[PDB]
Design a protein around this nucleic acid. Sequence first.
RNA 1: ACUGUGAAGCUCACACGCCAGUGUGGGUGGAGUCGUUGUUGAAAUACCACUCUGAUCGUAUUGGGCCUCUAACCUCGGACCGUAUAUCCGGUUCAGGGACAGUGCCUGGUGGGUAGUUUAACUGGGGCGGUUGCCUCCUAAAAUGUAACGGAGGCGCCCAAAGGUUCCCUCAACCUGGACGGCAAUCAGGUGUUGAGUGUAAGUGCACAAGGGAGCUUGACUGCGAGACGGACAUGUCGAGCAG
RNA 2: UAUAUAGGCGUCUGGGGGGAACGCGGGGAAGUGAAACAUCUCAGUACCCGUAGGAAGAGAAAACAAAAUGUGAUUCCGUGA
RNA 3: GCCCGGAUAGCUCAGGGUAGAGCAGGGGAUUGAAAAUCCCCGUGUCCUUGGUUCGAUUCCGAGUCCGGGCACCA
RNA 4: AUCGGGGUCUGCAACUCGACCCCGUGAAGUCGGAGUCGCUAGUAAUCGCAGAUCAGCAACGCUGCGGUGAAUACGUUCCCG
Lengths: 49, 102
Amino acid sequence: DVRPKITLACEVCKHRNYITKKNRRNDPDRLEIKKFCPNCGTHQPHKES
Amino acid sequence: TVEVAIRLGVDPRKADQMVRGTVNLPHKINFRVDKQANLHFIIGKASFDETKLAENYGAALDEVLRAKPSSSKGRYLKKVTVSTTTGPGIPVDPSVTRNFTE
RNA sequence: ACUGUGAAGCUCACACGCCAGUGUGGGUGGAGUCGUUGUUGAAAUACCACUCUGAUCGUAUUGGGCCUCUAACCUCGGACCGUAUAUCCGGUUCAGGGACAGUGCCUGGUGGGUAGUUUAACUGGGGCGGUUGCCUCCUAAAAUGUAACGGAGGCGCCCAAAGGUUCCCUCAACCUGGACGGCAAUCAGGUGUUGAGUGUAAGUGCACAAGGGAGCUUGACUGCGAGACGGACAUGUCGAGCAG
RNA sequence: UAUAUAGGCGUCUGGGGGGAACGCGGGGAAGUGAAACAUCUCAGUACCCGUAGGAAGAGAAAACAAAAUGUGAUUCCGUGA
RNA sequence: GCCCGGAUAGCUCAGGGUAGAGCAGGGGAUUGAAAAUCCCCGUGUCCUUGGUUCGAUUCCGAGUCCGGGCACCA
RNA sequence: AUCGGGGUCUGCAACUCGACCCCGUGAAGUCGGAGUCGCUAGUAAUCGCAGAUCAGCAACGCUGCGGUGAAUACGUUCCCG
Ligand SMILES: [Zn+2]
């Protein structure tokens, strides 16, 4: 839907920590972002579910 | 001679539903899903060692059992055959998955 | 891997067949193919195990479609009896239909034939027309607020950078000289203080730059939050600062 | 119509109907409220049908309870609320 | 939401190792002159993307435009 | 064929526009679709020579010469006059 809602999950513990939007035509591939994960307690890579 | 050829119940045509077996157990082999969704391995025959071939076969199964496709529907190990060069039959029991050598 | 529990070699039958020719069994004899084989997408058809395509058989399970039969059930078809009177009813028997039809429970359709109801408000009377939420300006009377079917517009998005941070720069317009080249493309010099530009309406701002360029990155975080703005309420808005 | 049945005679014993309220078992609305209305309420009310008794229905665990060796048929009051 | 069918030349429509045919258009034939017959041409991202294979218009996945039937009590 | 270079002749004059000579370059073309033309004997097929026009030729055209010289005609069934 051009700009759908996406959810970012930690790569270590796999907890859904954030939700955001991206353009699915400008950025067709799964987003990769470093975000603070409270469960781990530090900054871990996050990937689109 | 004799070998191992399992019939994993997966859809080979779908790209996601694919298997790539790779085990190493002497008691570094490779495997893949054929067109008809069949897996190939190396085993012994009935007229051979008892605790040697059986122990080596367990490691290959575990890698395959850990490689079951997520979307696979139905029974996974439909049949297993370890028949010899000319010896017909010799079909193993697919139920056994823990403590194969006993 | 096969070979006198008899191959090649011939000859007999059938199957498909684009007769390209292969496969199966039969009769005589008596020792075969085959491995690097040579073109190869890929190798030998030495053989083997799993298996696809269609066509063949078999067992066991399993659903339908038909044709009969009489015995359930059905007949406002005939004849007797209860019955002296009876086109009611019941019983007996003959003649037809027949596991169908009818009915009970479950289930899918058509269903104004019937029933219960809905069909907004504003409005210079009602209807037709137009409007209903959010953002910006004027009316608005130099704090805030202020109406009319008063005057003008925009929105129901977009950007993985057009966000964060560090460093650097000054536009638009005009004049003059230059191959195509022209009012107007790229280049050089000069005047030039904001007249350019800020994703998108308008307003308030921004040249100190919030405008232009480049390097690294994800704070487009987690637990909180003194003190306030605004308000019938429900909503809404700003925020220093502490820790990770 | 044969076994026999339906029926036909004779004789004894019962029933029918009425009543104000209370009872038990069935069938069962709408006005109204929801500031509209269909789920819902009104309400198992109004009304109707079948039957009683001086009262009726229920009643003697195929029950509660929760590790306490607890209660011990049913009915009706007050709390639990 | 679920299950099928369609997308191929200017137009219409057939199809694991071929992209084809009729109406079209063009040049040349036959005729005193035409049509139809003839010959020869150019016409094509096989809806758009990726996957398997030495190789896909053909098999698989996603998406776009369509069409039919059955679902839908914030 | 095409093209580069160097030459000969006529013409006052070879750029648009002559022929010929030499050196080099070396395209298409592997017998040609539907269709279509000529010929019955010195003919068709083929080979060379001369003339007109004319200074020079675009002549592979036109008019004549001679050399070597074939196959076939069942018959009006069909097209044209
Ligand atoms: Zn984590």
